[PDB]
Amino acid sequence: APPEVLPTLREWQGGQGEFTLTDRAGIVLDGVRDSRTAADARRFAGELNGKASVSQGRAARPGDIVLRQDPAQKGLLGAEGYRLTVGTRITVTAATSTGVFYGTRTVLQLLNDDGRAARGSATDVPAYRERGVGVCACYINISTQWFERLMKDMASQKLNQLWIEAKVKSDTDPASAFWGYYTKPQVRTLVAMARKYHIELVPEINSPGHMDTYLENHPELQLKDRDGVASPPRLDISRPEALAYYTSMVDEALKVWDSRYWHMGADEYMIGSSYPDYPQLQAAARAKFGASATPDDLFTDFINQVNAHVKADGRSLRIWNDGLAGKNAVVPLDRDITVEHWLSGGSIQQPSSLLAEGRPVMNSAYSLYLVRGGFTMQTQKLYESDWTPLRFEGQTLTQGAANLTGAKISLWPDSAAAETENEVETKVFMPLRFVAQATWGGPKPSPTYAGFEALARKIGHAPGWENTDRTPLADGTYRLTTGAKALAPTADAGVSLVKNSAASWALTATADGYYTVRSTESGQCLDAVRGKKYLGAPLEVGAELSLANCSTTARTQRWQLDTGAGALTLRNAISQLHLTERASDGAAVQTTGATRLTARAA
Ligand SMILES: CC(=O)N[C@@H]1[C@@H](O[C@@H]2O[C@H](CO)[C@H](O)[C@H](O)[C@H]2O)[C@@H](O)[C@@H](CO)O[C@H]1O
C-alpha cells in the first residue's frame, strides 16, 4: 500500500515495520559538500517536531534522516529525482541539491500525521520535466509576498516552473513605465526567491499582440489596417523598428530576470479572415518570402528573429500555440521554440502535429486556467476524469511523447477588480496540487476527489508559507494619524489628511486577509473608484481615494495593513498602491509610495 503523499511516488515497494521520528534523530548529509543543500537541510531540520541537528561529518545511524547528494547518480535520477528508503532510517539519495530538496518534501509529508511512516522504498523521478504555475501579473500588480508564498507552495509540491507575464519598470523606454509594473530590485528579489525554492522563472512580455501596455505611447509602432486604422495592442511587424523596439525591451527584461527562457506570448495576433484588411503585411511577407507568403509567415519570421536574438545570449524562446494555424505557407516556426498549447479550434495546429515536428510542446490548456471574474479550473472534474498532460484541448493523445514537456495552470486577471489576490490564492490550492500530481506522474492517491482534497488539506501549505501577519490590528475603532494630521472625510466623498482631526475609522478584518475601513463620521467605506481603469481596476497612480456605501463585493474597499513598529500603511487590495498624502491639498491618493499612519484606539 503506497504512502499518502502528494504528489504520489512513481512506484512503491512496501516493507514491514515503521520508521518513527525520535529525539535522537539527526539530519545527516553524507554525500558531497553543497552549501545550498546544507542551508535547505537546516530549514528542513527545523520543519520537523523536535530538535534535529544537521551534520556532514559523521556516519548515519538508525533513526536518522540521511540526505545523500551523489553527483554520480545524475544519469539515473536526473536533475530532480531521488531514491527514497523508509527503513530503520530514512535515506534520500539524489544527484543534485534539487533532488535532495524534493526528497525532503516527501519526508515532511511522511512524518506529518504522527511522526511515523510505513517502511518501503521508491525511485521517485518526475514523469514530466516542466511542472508549472503561470501568473499573469499584467495591468494589476501581484505582491512579492504573494509570489514568495506561491513559490514555497510550488516547491513543497515539487512544481519547478513559474511563468510570469509582467512589466519591468523600464529605463530603456520610460514611456512604458506606468502601473502596473515591477521595479528592477523587485524582479531581482523574485529571481532570488525562485533560486532558493528550486524554481525556474519564465518571464514574458507579450508580442506582437497584447502590447497595449507598451504601445499606448508609441502610436508610430502600431499596426494599421487597409483603412489606416491603428490596432493599439498590435505591433506593426512589417517595420524593422518594431523588432528593434521589442528586442530592446526583451533585452532589458532578460538582464534582470536572468532566465534561461524567454516567453514572447505571440497569442491572439491575427487570423486569415483578416488578411484583406492588412495588404501591407501581405506585401512585406511576399517581398521577403515569395508569392505564397502570408501575414502569418511574417508573424512566424518575427518570432524566429526574436529566437535568433535571444539564442545569441544563450537563451531559449517560448510562445503560445494559437497563431500556429497552418497559414504560414513558407516560414516554419523554428523547431527549438517551445510551444505552450492552451487552445484548439479551426485550423489551429493539433498537439499531435506539433509533437510530430519534434518541438517541445507544453500542455497549458485553458481548462487549467483560473481567471479573475471568469473561468475557474474544475479540479474535481479533471481528477474524476483522469486528466494527464496527454489530454490537450481538442485532442487526447493515445500515448506519451518524449517532447511533451509537462503542464501548468495559469492565473489571469481578466476582470481584475472581481477578485483579490488572496481570494485567488485560496482558489488555487487544489489546482496547484492537482497539476503537481498530474505532472509528477505517480498513481492516483484515492478513487474519490474527496479523499485527494482531504489529503491535500491535511498536508496543508508548505512550511514557512505564511510570510505576513494579515490581522495586525484587533477589529475596532482607530484614529489613523501622521504628525498633526489624521485621516478624515472631506468634501465630495473625498478623504484627506486633515490637521488636528479627531476622525476615526472602524477597521474590520475581511475573510481574505484585508480590512474594511469605515468612517465613524459618515458610515461609508474607504474605496478606490477614481482615475483610469485597466481591466476594470483603478490602476492610476495619483488617483484620489474616496468614500462609498459599504459593499460585501466591492474588492476595492479591501485594505491590506502593511506593518512597521510604530506605524502601518494601507494598501488597496486591488490596485496594490498605498494611501499617500498628496502634498498640494492633503488629499489621500494612491501611489507607489505610502504615508505612514499610527493607529490609535479611540
Ligand atoms: C494565451 C491566452 O490565454 N490568451 C488569452 C489571455 O490573454 C492574456 O490576457 C492578459 C490579461 O488578462 C494579458 O493581456 C496577456 O498579454 C494576454 O495574453 C487571457 O485573456 C486568457 C484568460 O481568459 O484567455 C486567452 O484568450
Q: Is 214 in the pocket of ligand 1 (CB under 6 A)?
A: no
Residues with Cβ within 8 Å of residue 266, at least 6 apart in sequence: 206, 207, 208, 209, 299, 303, 319, 320, 323
Nearest CA to ligand 1 atom 6: 412
Main-chain dihedrals φ then ψ at residue 329, nearest 5 degrees: -75, -20
Cis peptide before 208 (omega within 30 of 0): yes
* DSSP per position, 258-314: --SEEEEE--S---GGGGGG-HHHHHHHHHHH-TT--HHHHHHHHHHHHHHHHHTTT
Cis peptide before 7 (omega within 30 of 0): yes
d(CA 233, CA 216): 8
Between the alpha carbon of residue 515 and those of residues 45, 478, 549, the distances in Å are 36, 13, 15
Main-chain dihedrals φ then ψ at residue 328, nearest 5 degrees: -85, 85
Residues with Cβ within 8 Å of residue 118, at least 6 apart in sequence: 1, 3, 14, 15, 17, 18, 86
Q: Is 408 in the pocket of ligand 1 (CB under 6 A)?
A: no
Report CA Rg, the chain. Answer: 26
CATH 2.40.50.140 fits 476-601, yes or no: no
Q: Which atom of ligand 1 is nearest to the CA of 414?
A: 12
Q: Is 342 in the pocket of ligand 1 (CB under 6 A)?
A: yes
DSSP 599: E
Residues with Cβ within 8 Å of residue 394, at least 6 apart in sequence: 343, 344, 345, 348, 350, 351
Kindly give the residue spans of alpha helices, DSSP state H, lying in 385-503: 421-440, 449-459
d(CA 431, CA 340): 18
What nine digits make up the cell of 162? 513559474
The closest alpha carbon to 541, from 183, 180, 169, belongs to: 180
CA 413 / ligand 1 centre spacing (Å): 8
The closest alpha carbon to 345, from 298, 297, 296, 395, belongs to: 395
Asked whether the beta carbons of 195 and 263 are under 8 A apart, the reply is no
d(CA 262, CA 268): 18
Main-chain dihedrals φ then ψ at residue 298, nearest 5 degrees: -60, -45
Q: Which helix (H) or strand (E) holds 18?
A: strand 13-20
CATH number of this structure's domain 130-459: 3.20.20.80
What nine digits make up the cell of 340? 505552450
Q: Which atom of ligand 1 is nearest to the CA of 268?
A: 4
Residues with Cβ within 8 Å of residue 388, at least 6 apart in sequence: 438, 441
Between the alpha carbon of residue 352 and those of residues 296, 363, 390, 439, 543, the distances in Å are 21, 12, 10, 19, 50
Using DSSP's 3-state secondary structure scheme, residue 8 falls into coil
d(CA 461, CA 445): 18
For the chain, the helix, strand and coil percentages under 3-state DSSP, each to the nearest 5: 30, 30, 45
Between the alpha carbon of residue 1 and those of residues 6, 9, 12, 115, the distances in Å are 15, 11, 8, 18
Residue by residue, what is the 3-state secondary structure of 165-232?
EECECCCCCHHHCCCCCECHHHHHHHHHHHHHCCCEEEEEEEECCCCHHHHCCCHHHEEECCCCCEEE
Asked whether the beta carbons of 380 and 449 are under 8 A apart, the reply is yes
Asked whether the beta carbons of 77 and 50 are under 8 A apart, the reply is no
Annotated active-site residue in 268, 466, 540, 581:
268
Q: Is 146 in the pocket of ligand 1 (CB under 6 A)?
A: no
Cis peptide before 180 (omega within 30 of 0): yes
At residue 554's C-alpha, the angle toward residues 548 and 558, to 5°, is 90
Between the alpha carbon of residue 192 and those of residues 102, 157, 187, 296, 450, the distances in Å are 19, 19, 9, 38, 37
Between the alpha carbon of residue 330 and those of residues 296, 326, 327, 400, the distances in Å are 9, 10, 9, 30
d(CA 562, CA 580): 13
The one-letter code for the residue type at 195 is: R
d(CA 433, CA 453): 9
What nine digits make up the cell of 198? 528550486
Give the count of alpha carbons within 13 A of 589, CB side only: 17
Maximum CA pair distance of the chain?
Answer: 79
Q: Is 414 in the pocket of ligand 1 (CB under 6 A)?
A: yes
Between the alpha carbon of residue 384 and those of residues 157, 379, 448, 450, the distances in Å are 20, 8, 7, 10
Asked whether the beta carbons of 146 and 413 are under 8 A apart, the reply is no
Q: Is 138 in the pocket of ligand 1 (CB under 6 A)?
A: yes
Residues with Cβ within 8 Å of residue 569, at least 6 apart in sequence: 561, 562, 578, 579, 594, 595, 596, 597
Q: For 63, left (φ over 0), alpha (ψ -120 to 50), or beta?
A: left
* DSSP per position, 55-76: ESSSPP-TT-EEEEE-GGGHHH
Between the alpha carbon of residue 270 and those of residues 209, 287, 298, 450, the distances in Å are 8, 19, 11, 43
Q: Is 206 a known ligand-binding residue? A: yes
Kindly give the residue spans of alpha helices, DSSP state H, lying in 441-514: 449-459
The closest alpha carbon to 519, from 420, 437, 602, 404, belongs to: 602
CA 375 / ligand 1 centre spacing (Å): 12
Q: Is 212 in the pocket of ligand 1 (CB under 6 A)?
A: no
Q: Which atom of ligand 1 is nearest to the CA of 413?
A: 12
Crossing angle for the helix pair 184-196 and 144-156, nearest 10 degrees?
20
Crossing angle for the helix pair 449-459 and 421-440, nearest 10 degrees?
110
Q: Is 258 in the pocket of ligand 1 (CB under 6 A)?
A: no
Nearest CA to ligand 1 atom 20: 414
What nine digits make up the cell of 241? 523598428
Domain ranges in the chain are 13-124, 130-459, 476-601
Task: Write the class of the CATH domain 13-124.
Answer: alpha beta
The count of residues in the chain is 602
Between the alpha carbon of residue 194 and those of residues 67, 80, 197, 297, the distances in Å are 22, 15, 5, 36
d(CA 366, CA 377): 8
Nearest CA to ligand 1 atom 26: 268
The closest alpha carbon to 388, from 348, 453, 443, belongs to: 443
Instruction: Please choose from 211, 267, 348 the residue to mutate so as to test ligand 1's pocket, defined by most ligand atoms within 8 A of CB.
Output: 267
The one-letter code for the residue type at 196 is: K
Q: Which helix (H) or strand (E) holds 566?
A: none
- How many C-beta atoms surround the C-beta of residue 332 within 10 A? 12
The closest alpha carbon to 261, from 451, 107, 130, belongs to: 130
Main-chain dihedrals φ then ψ at residue 445, nearest 5 degrees: -65, -50
d(CA 263, CA 317): 6
d(CA 187, CA 170): 12
d(CA 5, CA 10): 11
| Pairing state between β 130-137 and 404-412 | parallel
- How many C-beta atoms surround the C-beta of residue 30 within 10 A? 18
The closest alpha carbon to 44, from 22, 33, 63, 29, belongs to: 29
d(CA 520, CA 502): 10
Buried b (16+ CB within 10 A) or exposed e, 401-440: bebbbbbbbbbbbbebbbbbbbbbbebbbbbbbbbbbbbb
Nearest CA to ligand 1 atom 11: 414
DSSP 4: -
Asked whether the beta carbons of 320 and 297 are under 8 A apart, the reply is no
CA 510 / ligand 1 centre spacing (Å): 29
What nine digits make up the cell of 507? 477597521
Q: Which helix (H) or strand (E) holds 392?
A: strand 391-392
Q: Is 369 in the pocket of ligand 1 (CB under 6 A)?
A: yes
Give the torsion sign (CA, 491, 493, 498, 502). Answer: positive
Q: Is 374 in the pocket of ligand 1 (CB under 6 A)?
A: yes
Asked whether the beta carbons of 173 and 214 are under 8 A apart, the reply is yes
d(CA 403, CA 356): 9
| First-to-last C-alpha distance (Å) of the chain | 60
Instruction: Please choose from 412, 421, 533, 534 the residue to mutate so as to test ligand 1's pocket, defined by most ligand atoms within 8 A of CB.
Output: 412
d(CA 274, CA 271): 6
CA 412 / ligand 1 centre spacing (Å): 7
Residue by residue, what is the 3-state secondary structure of 497-562?
EEECCCCCEEEEECCCCCEEEEECCCCCEEECCCCCEECCEECCCCCECEEECCCCCCHHHCEEEE
Using DSSP's 3-state secondary structure scheme, residue 491 falls into coil
Q: Is 332 in the pocket of ligand 1 (CB under 6 A)?
A: no
Asked whether the beta carbons of 363 and 341 are under 8 A apart, the reply is yes
Crossing angle for the helix pair 295-311 and 279-289, nearest 10 degrees?
60
Asked whether the beta carbons of 429 and 455 are under 8 A apart, the reply is no
Main-chain dihedrals φ then ψ at residue 50, nearest 5 degrees: 95, -165
Instruction: Please choose from 164, 210, 371 the residue to mutate so as to test ligand 1's pocket, defined by most ligand atoms within 8 A of CB.
Output: 210
Asked whether the beta carbons of 432 and 133 are under 8 A apart, the reply is yes
Residue by residue, what is the 3-state secondary structure of 333-351?
CCCCCEEEECCCCCCCCCH
d(CA 421, CA 537): 13
Q: Which atom of ligand 1 is nearest to the CA of 340?
A: 1
Instruction: Please choose from 135, 136, 340, 408 the residue to mutate so as to test ligand 1's pocket, defined by most ligand atoms within 8 A of CB.
Output: 136
Asked whether the beta carbons of 432 and 156 are under 8 A apart, the reply is no
Q: Which atom of ligand 1 is nearest to the CA of 210?
A: 16
The closest alpha carbon to 116, from 25, 53, 11, 13, belongs to: 25
CA 265 / ligand 1 centre spacing (Å): 9
Q: Is 414 a known ligand-binding residue? A: yes
- How many C-beta atoms surround the C-beta of residue 224 within 10 A? 17
Q: Is 265 in the pocket of ligand 1 (CB under 6 A)?
A: yes
What nine digits make up the cell of 149? 508564498
| 581 part of the active site | no
Which structural technique was applied? X-ray
